[PDB]
């Protein structure tokens, strides 16, 4: 039982139980279902994407500025301050990527519009498939830098 | 703290804390706030919904069956248990409205489009306004029957 990737963890050093999908990185206190079989996951999939780079990334530059010079731990920093933000209902995806995301797609408000599998770098591929329609992954690296994906369809 | 109508809550005889709203019934172990003042209300807000009916509906009668005989008990059981089915991530909203919201809204995958108030029902209304965008309720009472809606604008 339990989707692809999702399973029940614990926080260290605490008791805190909650779940983990591992290909998305997403956590959350909910148990991710209740049967449907055989299922496999969408051919096609429609997504909205908050990026932050840092130094490492490809190209370490952006609309926001021309030179990130924030480290990987600054950027998962951030993105986790996002995906709370997100979370608590305080402010709404599109709206922190249309200001934040270090993706040319803020100007759509972080839509990548609908993709297959080979488009995109495999790892943000792999956790956009494993999401159901609605869901939001947790911090996704890439080569690009670190992402919050949002499937819309 | 806390955004309007949300209050820390614990389960009766038990140990389960969460976070309930007072005006939409919605229920969750998320804190949903982590500041904005001065807010309000939105004046306008575009909403889905999935409706069950019961024999004390003012009209208990739908596309789905020409005389609703369930109780206003088992109405909020199948409710509870949609609510149930979409916060697993098993099954959309859109999907399970299609299927069994009794309204014929259920024809455009419960899509209301958008209203300001004045114009439904008032407990459906309050909950609807006090909806961030993304956000679904609890189960909402109205003369129609329980609602589950989902503020989609």
Redesign the interface.
Known sequence: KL?PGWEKRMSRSSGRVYYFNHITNASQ??????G?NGQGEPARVRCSHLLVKHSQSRRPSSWRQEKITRTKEEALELINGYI??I????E??ESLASQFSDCSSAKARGDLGAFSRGQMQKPFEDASFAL????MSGPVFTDSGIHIILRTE
Request: charged share 45%; no cysteine.
């Open positions: 989707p206190w909910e148990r991710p279902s209740g449907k709370q933000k979370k608590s209902g305080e709404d995806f159901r329609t609605g869901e």
